[PDB]
């Protein structure tokens, strides 16, 4: 991110599979996205860890299909925050912002679009 980066925009989503992990998350805290390409159920898998690096859950397969290519090619940095419901039991909401270089803005938006997503303000 050399001569800086720009906001491509934002996306809301869900951390799922909560019941299988014990990673604690507090409201309005950063979570981290971490690719799990070797995942047996899905090559696009993306784990969601708390700031300490304990697994909290996974992104839903549709969002993961959308984002995997973007993380793999470093087309954008993704910042995720759990805005509310961090103590939910099955799923938790997840706010995302996408940042990167101007010249990758279209690469990013096409990748999202072909998987059914569009960044917003």
UniProtKB/Swiss-Prot annotation:
Signal peptide range in chain numbering: none
Subcellular location: Cytoplasm; Nucleus; Nucleus, Nucleolus; Nucleus, Nucleoplasm
Tissue occurrence: Expressed in brain, heart, kidney, liver, lung, pancreas, placenta and skeletal muscle.
Covalent cross-link Glycyl lysine isopeptide (Lys-Gly) (interchain with G-Cter in SUMO2) as placed by the record, residue numbers: 60
Coiled-coil intervals, chain numbering: none
Function: Has both helicase and E3 ubiquitin ligase activities. Possesses intrinsic ATP-dependent nucleosome-remodeling activity; This activity may be required for transcriptional activation or repression of specific target promoters. These may include the SERPINE1 and HIV-1 promoters and the SV40 enhancer, to which this protein can bind directly. Plays a role in error-free postreplication repair (PRR) of damaged DNA and maintains genomic stability through acting as a ubiquitin ligase for 'Lys-63'-linked polyubiquitination of chromatin-bound PCNA.
Additional record remark: Subject to frequent epigenetic inactivation by promoter methylation in colon cancer.
Subunit structure: Interacts with SP1 and SP3 independently of DNA; the interaction with these transcriptional factors may be required for basal transcription of target genes. Interacts with EGR1; the interaction requires prior binding to DNA and represses c-Rel via a DNA looping mechanism. Interacts with GATA4. Interacts with PCNA; the interaction promotes polyubiquitination of PCNA through association with the UBE2B-RAD18 and UBE2V2-UBE2N ubiquitin ligase complexes. Interacts with RAD18, SHPRH, UBE2V2 and UBE2N.
Family in the record: Belongs to the SNF2/RAD54 helicase family. RAD16 subfamily.
Protein name: Helicase-like transcription factor
Source organism of this protein record: Homo sapiens (Human)
Upper taxonomic lineage: Eukaryota, Metazoa, Chordata, Craniata, Vertebrata
Annotated gene: HLTF
